[PDB]
Design a protein around this ligand. Structure first.
Ligand SMILES: Nc1nc2c(ncn2[C@@H]2O[C@H](COP(=O)(O)O)[C@@H](O)[C@H]2O)c(=O)[nH]1
Ligand SMILES: [Co+2]
Ligand SMILES: [Co+2]
Length: 490
């Protein structure tokens, strides 16, 4: 196929959405769509054009291949931050009818870092309160939070605790005093997936997992101190405790570390057998999957949920440590600093959700790999404080640019099953990067300084284009813009 031929199946629906017609890839059950603005459009097509003239297929082709998966409903959707990934693209949403016996679960549609995600903390501090002790604060966050490839947990944990954490999620953290009661209330799934079964997490996963529980990791993972730069939705900001520009917040991004990676890996191995036996055909081996009802599909879903709970405990630990560091620098209690959790969302998980599709409300398995749930106003499952706003959505940009808080919308619930973006996304000298941060007034403590070129803001897309695409499309609504002033990296 020539590049021009590829264009035959690509048709622009509206200002910010493209349609991927059936036939782009073989056996598509539904169409594919990708939401982008004029600036994001160029890169999608340039990547497709370069393929006509890595270990992953072009993002566009990955969206179509997921569209060929059995049991899918509605459309295979690529968000504006979409980039190529393992099987599913990072920034993709695919939902499956759980009453269809052909419907599958795909670990590639969740991701190796199971329940990678973001927690947003607010404070009653102002940028003028932090600027004088900025270096001291960053140092304190670094000393307190294990960060880096081989860092061990600070909060001591043994196998029993891990086992309880796999089953209980934030509830273990609450029970032992590391989490506040309100943290659980403002957390997606209330920090606890009930379907988790620690027996479906392997021994190797647990061995890897135990010393990393209570650690940040590396690469994209961060603890970032931010200032509210703009407020787009005053009402929503007020419900999140944010009332003025200058307010200081903390954003934490982490997942399930080695435990989750192993669980994902074990599932992929196990799924090869399931596919042959159950006659499952895929366009791409990275889309290896299992029938939801099969033992392979069920074992993975339960182990995924357990890894999910792990990640919530991990972000809870990070929060406790963060509160501790802030407390020390400012010689006050975390409560007097108003260091409450605004929200905690995943952007790597499969969820069982009720959704109207093809006229009837149905029970779907919603795969969100590199995308974020964004439930609308009046959804029964979200907390009382966000009933009128809709669900907060935490979008980290980069360490040198900006981040956003968005809210879920009814239109998002309709068009994308309440799914929006998760970040800027990857786009298609290390001392320079550090120097630039310093120029900008951004403090930083990094476990591995020579590797910061990889995490430079130039390697990601423009996050403001990504959120504005989702905003104009209507699937999530801008609420708050944040600016980093200090960041911890691995
Ligand atoms: N705020 C902030 N966001 C980041 C940083 N590094 C990566 N991100 C964002 O976090 C998102 C999550 O990454 P992912 O989970 O896809 O690997 C990325 O798409 C990227 O935009 C950082 O240092 N600070
Ligand atoms: Co991650
Ligand atoms: Co992430």
């Amino acid at each position: 196929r020539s590049y021009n031929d590829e264009l035959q199946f690509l048709e622009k629906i509206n200002k910010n959405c493209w349609r991927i017609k059936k036939g782009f890839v073989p056996n598509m059950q539904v169409e594919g769509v990708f939401y982008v603005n004029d600036a994001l459009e160029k890169l999608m097509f340039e990547e497709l054009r370069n393929a006509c003239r890595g270990g992953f297929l072009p993002a566009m082709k990955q969206i179509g291949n997921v569209a060929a998966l059995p049991g899918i409903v509605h459309r295979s959707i690529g968000l504006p931050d979409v980039h190529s990934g393992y099987g599913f693209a990072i920034g993709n949403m695919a939902a499956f009818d759980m009453n269809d016996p052909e419907a599958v679960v795909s670990p590639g549609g969740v991701g190796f870092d199971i329940n990678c995600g973001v927690r947003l903390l607010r404070t009653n501090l102002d940028e003028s309160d932090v600027q004088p002790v900025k270096e001291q604060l960053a140092q304190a966050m670094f000393d307190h939070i294990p960060v880096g490839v081989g860092s061990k947990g600070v909060i001591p944990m043994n196998a029993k605790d891990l086992e309880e954490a796999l089953e209980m999620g934030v509830d273990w953290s609450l029970r032992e005093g590391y989490a506040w009661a309100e943290d659980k209330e403002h957390c997606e799934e209330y920090g606890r997936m009930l379907q988790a079964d620690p027996n479906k997490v392997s021994a190797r996963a647990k061995k890897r997992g135990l010393p990393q529980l209570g650690t940040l990791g590396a690469g994209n993972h961060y603890a970032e101190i931010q200032v509210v730069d703009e407020i787009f939705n005053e009402y929503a900001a007020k419900k999140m405790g944010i009332d003025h520009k200058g307010q200081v917040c903390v954003m934490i991004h982490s997942g399930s570390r080695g435990l989750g990676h192993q669980v994902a890996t074990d599932a992929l191995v196990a799924m090869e057998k399931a596919m042959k036996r159950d006659k499952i055909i895929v366009n791409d081996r990275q889309l290896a999957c299992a029938r939801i009802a099969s033992p392979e599909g069920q074992d993975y879903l339960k182990g995924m949920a357990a890894a999910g709970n792990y990640a919530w405990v991990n972000r809870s630990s990070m929060t406790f440590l963060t509160r501790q560091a802030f407390a020390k620098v400012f010689n006050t209690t975390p409560d007097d600093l108003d260091l409450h959790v605004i929200y905690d969302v995943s952007h790597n998980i499969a969820k069982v959700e009720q959704h109207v599709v093809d006229g009837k409300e149905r029970t779907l398995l919603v795969h969100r790999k590199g995308s974020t749930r964004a439930f609308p106003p009046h959804h029964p499952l979200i907390a009382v404080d966000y009933q009128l706003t809709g669900q907060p959505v935490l979008i980290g940009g980069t360490m040198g640019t900006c981040s956003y808080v968005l809210t879920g919308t009814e239109q998002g619930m309709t068009e994308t099953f309440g799914t929006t973006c998760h970040g800027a996304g990857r786009a298609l000298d290390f001392q320079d990067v550090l120097d630039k941060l310093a120029d900008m007034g951004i403090a930083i403590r990094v476990a591995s300084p020579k590797l910061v070129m990889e995490e430079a803001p130039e390697s990601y897309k423009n996050v403001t284009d990504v959120v504005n695409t989702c905003h104009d499309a209507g699937i999530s609504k801008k609420a708050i813009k944040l600016r980093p002033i200090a960041v911890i990296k691995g």
